[PDB]
Design an enzyme around this catalytic site. Structure first.
Site, PDB file in Angstrom:
ATOM      1  CD  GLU A 474       7.985 -51.621   1.130  1.00 12.62           C
ATOM      2  OE1 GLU A 474       7.509 -50.972   2.058  1.00 12.62           O
ATOM      3  OE2 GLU A 474       7.321 -52.514   0.561  1.00 12.62           O
TER       4      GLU A 474
HETATM    5  C1  LIG Z   1       4.700 -40.268  -0.437  1.00  9.86           C
HETATM    6  O1  LIG Z   1       4.806 -40.138  -1.657  1.00  9.86           O
HETATM    7  C2  LIG Z   1       3.987 -41.532  -0.008  1.00  9.86           C
HETATM    8  C3  LIG Z   1       2.901 -41.910  -1.013  1.00  9.86           C
HETATM    9  O2  LIG Z   1       4.932 -42.608   0.201  1.00  9.86           O
HETATM   10  C4  LIG Z   1       5.220 -43.185   1.493  1.00  9.86           C
HETATM   11  C5  LIG Z   1       5.767 -42.181   2.545  1.00  9.86           C
HETATM   12  N1  LIG Z   1       5.184 -42.328   3.888  1.00  9.86           N
HETATM   13  C6  LIG Z   1       3.888 -42.006   4.173  1.00  9.86           C
HETATM   14  C7  LIG Z   1       3.404 -42.194   5.591  1.00  9.86           C
HETATM   15  O3  LIG Z   1       3.094 -41.586   3.326  1.00  9.86           O
HETATM   16  C8  LIG Z   1       7.305 -42.220   2.601  1.00  9.86           C
HETATM   17  O4  LIG Z   1       7.880 -42.157   1.295  1.00  9.86           O
HETATM   18  C9  LIG Z   1       8.646 -43.395   1.226  1.00  9.86           C
HETATM   19  C10 LIG Z   1       7.614 -44.273   1.875  1.00  9.86           C
HETATM   20  O5  LIG Z   1       7.715 -43.483   3.094  1.00  9.86           O
HETATM   21  C11 LIG Z   1       6.145 -44.410   1.409  1.00  9.86           C
HETATM   22  O6  LIG Z   1       5.667 -45.397   2.328  1.00  9.86           O
HETATM   23  C12 LIG Z   1       5.555 -46.773   2.143  1.00  9.86           C
HETATM   24  O7  LIG Z   1       4.424 -47.097   1.409  1.00  9.86           O
HETATM   25  C13 LIG Z   1       4.387 -48.535   1.065  1.00  9.86           C
HETATM   26  C14 LIG Z   1       3.193 -48.710   0.157  1.00  9.86           C
HETATM   27  O8  LIG Z   1       3.308 -47.916  -1.027  1.00  9.86           O
HETATM   28  C15 LIG Z   1       4.346 -49.379   2.376  1.00  9.86           C
HETATM   29  O9  LIG Z   1       4.550 -50.796   2.039  1.00  9.86           O
HETATM   30  C16 LIG Z   1       5.450 -48.889   3.287  1.00  9.86           C
HETATM   31  O10 LIG Z   1       5.453 -49.532   4.544  1.00  9.86           O
HETATM   32  C17 LIG Z   1       5.325 -47.380   3.564  1.00  9.86           C
HETATM   33  N2  LIG Z   1       6.415 -47.014   4.493  1.00  9.86           N
HETATM   34  C18 LIG Z   1       6.291 -46.127   5.496  1.00  9.86           C
HETATM   35  C19 LIG Z   1       7.503 -45.902   6.348  1.00  9.86           C
HETATM   36  O11 LIG Z   1       5.258 -45.500   5.735  1.00  9.86           O
END
Ligand SMILES: *C(=O)[C@@H](C)O[C@@H]1[C@@H](NC(C)=O)[C@@H]2OC[C@@H](O2)[C@H]1O[C@@H]1O[C@H](CO)[C@@H](O)[C@H](O)[C@H]1NC(C)=O
Length: 610
Positions: A474
């Site tokens: 997350e």
């Molecule tokens: C990196 O591998 C990506 C795919 O993962 C995201 C990343 N943030 C962004 C903006 O890409 C970072 O890595 C840990 C998480 O923050 C991940 O984000 C989260 O993605 C899930 C869906 O897969 C959402 O439910 C979360 O809210 C989102 N969290 C955030 C802070 O963007």
């Protein structure tokens, strides 16, 4: 010493440069000095000489915000007619479409007509409104006979595809001959269901054909069955290009296969028999799996292109569809053995099917202190470090991520290690993942907030590995994280979700971003996670999906299953985003299981069938 560089920053932003210029010859070897120099020049950018600006770009061109300077300056150069200097600094890899349009104007007035026509068309064929600079360029381009009616059509199509109907309307209003079909395209793109009136879309021309195709592709998302019928009517009636048919069959096929309708299979096999579209190919195999047709699925897995055939995904399903097709055969054992021993979701699934231990293989990387010096010494690092030491975490982070855009594989790793050692768990993950160094599990699966996550796990009767895994997926432990939709914290709670669990559990209400505090966020997220956990009979597969996609969506994906294997269900989740979310969380929980000394199989006994 203790540099009060804040005086200069307080004077400058917003005001004057008197203390800065006093101090400029005092803070020679302060790492943040060039941020002051940047603002001092930016306030007076419009009167600065080319020479002084070029000197700043030569000697401080590594600053994060240098792109904003180049944009502001190149815009002035062009707006004064200084094209020679413009062209010397115009970088297409800044991706400022404003600049790209100015460069196009340059090309058309400095003898590069073929190149300026190509630049113009590239910027013409987008479905969104372009900056004002591009009006001029489209002006020149049109002026020289180039904006033909086909190109206006092609852009109408893109605009309508993008849902920019105001732009689409203006472009229909600019068609000398096709303005009827153009208005139809805007109408049909707004409500593609009018295609059911087959008598209004009878005219045998490419234009009407194209209108109908866009409409069917749109209709496919909402009502693929309806789209299929109308495709059945229109395919003998209008002169579709084979490209147009294939693009229509793709959207209808995928949308049918995502709702497990075997009418997808024949349609998908006619219009992509060579398995060129990877998304179609994966979804044909997925569908055969959802329908229990193991023979056909095995067969299909043997024909896959070399890029899909090499994924741990299609290696697993080749073995499994075979084992399900021929349960007495010994060939899946040897395919599973190649695959168990990898540290990913399908590796663990393979391990599970042989019932052998999962292979973690934690090896911290092998970085000489030589390479570590370069990165700790780098100006960008020094700046980030000094920014971090003052609270300026956004700046620190902005430095850290801008540095990494140029760093090679070894440095990225050293970078990662440095970040790790500061509790900067998220940047360290970003660095190491960018290095594609997957085997450093100390860095990639950190244990922040260990006492709180484990306490809150045990109170709600949850496996602690699961709460780490959800957290890790997350926010990657960035404790102040805020999403593209407003979810806050370690477990990314929405503000309504948080107040509704606070109520249910009699946990104290959070100020809508007191969720930033770890110990408050983990308490609510754990409680809420237990709420979805118990709502799907303690199934973490289903509950994980629910957490990401809401309980309603998961309940649609469970009908009508009967005795559906968990791996098939995971693989046939309609949304890529949540399939991956589930696979990640399950995988992470296995890894956290070993680090917590609380072993956790990829799926529990009670999760294997629903
Ligand atoms: C990196 O591998 C990506 C795919 O993962 C995201 C990343 N943030 C962004 C903006 O890409 C970072 O890595 C840990 C998480 O923050 C991940 O984000 C989260 O993605 C899930 C869906 O897969 C959402 O439910 C979360 O809210 C989102 N969290 C955030 C802070 O963007």
């Amino acid at each position: 010493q203790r540099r009060l560089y804040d005086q200069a920053k307080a004077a400058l932003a917003k005001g004057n440069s008197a203390p800065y210029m006093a101090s400029r010859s005092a803070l020679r070897d302060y790492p943040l000095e060039p941020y002051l120099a940047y603002d001092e020049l930016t306030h007076r950018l419009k009167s600065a000489s080319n020479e002084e600006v070029e000197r700043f770009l030569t000697e401080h061109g590594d600053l994060p915000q240098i792109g904003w300077l180049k944009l502001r300056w190149l815009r002035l150069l062009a707006d004064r007619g200084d094209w020679k200097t413009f062209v010397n600094y115009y970088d297409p890899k800044l991706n400022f479409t404003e600049l790209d349009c100015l460069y196009g104007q340059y090309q058309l007035g400095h003898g590069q007509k073929a190149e300026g026509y190509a630049t113009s068309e590239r910027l013409w064929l987008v479905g969104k409104s372009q900056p004002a600079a591009c009006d001029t360029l489209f002006g020149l381009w049109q002026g020289e006979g180039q904006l033909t009616e086909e190109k206006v059509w092609k852009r109408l199509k893109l605009a309508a595809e993008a849902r920019n109907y105001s732009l689409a309307s203006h472009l229909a209003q600019r068609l000398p001959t096709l303005g009827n079909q153009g208005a139809l395209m805007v109408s049909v793109a707004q409500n593609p269901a009018q295609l059911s009136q087959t008598g209004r879309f009878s005219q045998r021309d490419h234009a009407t054909a194209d209108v109908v195709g866009l409409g069917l592709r749109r209709l496919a998302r909402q009502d693929p069955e309806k789209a299929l019928s109308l495709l059945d009517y229109y395919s003998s009636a209008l002169p579709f290009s084979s490209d147009e048919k294939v693009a229509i069959a793709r959207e209808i096929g995928l949308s049918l296969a995502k709702r497990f309708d075997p009418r997808a299979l024949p349609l998908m096999t006619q219009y992509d028999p060579g398995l060129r579209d990877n998304t179609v190919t994966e979804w044909r195999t997925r569908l055969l799996l959802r329908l229990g047709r193991w023979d056909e699925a095995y067969a299909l897995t043997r024909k896959l292109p070399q890029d899909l055939a090499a994924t741990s995904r299609w290696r697993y399903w080749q073995a499994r569809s075979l084992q399900l097709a021929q349960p007495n055969s010994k060939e899946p054992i040897a395919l599973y053995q190649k695959l168990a021993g990898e540290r990913d979701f399908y590796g663990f699934l393979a391990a599970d099917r042989l019932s052998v231990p999962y292979k973690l293989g934690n090896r911290p990387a092998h970085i000489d202190p030589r390479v570590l010096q370069r990165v700790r010494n780098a100006a960008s690092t020094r700046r980030a470090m000094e920014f971090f030491n003052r609270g300026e975490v956004i700046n620190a982070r902005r430095e850290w991520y801008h540095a990494a855009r140029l760093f090679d594989r070894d440095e990225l790793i050293a970078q990662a290690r440095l970040a790790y050692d500061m509790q900067w768990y998220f940047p360290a993950i970003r660095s190491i993942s960018q290095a594609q160094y997957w085997d450093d599990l100390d860095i990639r699966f950190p244990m922040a907030h260990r006492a709180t996550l484990v306490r809150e796990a045990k109170n709600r009767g949850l496996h602690s590995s699961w709460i780490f895994a959800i957290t890790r997926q997350e926010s990657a432990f960035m404790s102040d994280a805020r999403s593209g939709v407003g979810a806050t914290g370690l477990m990314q709670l929405m503000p309504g979700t948080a107040k509704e669990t606070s109520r249910k559990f009699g946990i104290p209400l959070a100020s809508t971003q007191q969720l930033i505090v770890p110990d408050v966020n983990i308490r609510l997220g754990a409680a809420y996670l237990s709420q979805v956990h118990s709502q799907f009979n303690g199934n973490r597969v289903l509950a994980s999906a629910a957490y990401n996609a809401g309980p309603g969506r998961v309940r649609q994906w469970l009908k009508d299953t009967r005795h559906l294997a968990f791996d098939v269900w995971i693989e046939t989740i309609p949304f890529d985003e949540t399939r991956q979310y589930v696979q990640n969380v399950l995988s992470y929980a296995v890894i956290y299981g070993q680090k917590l000394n609380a072993p956790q199989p990829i799926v529990d006994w009670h999760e294997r069938y629903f």
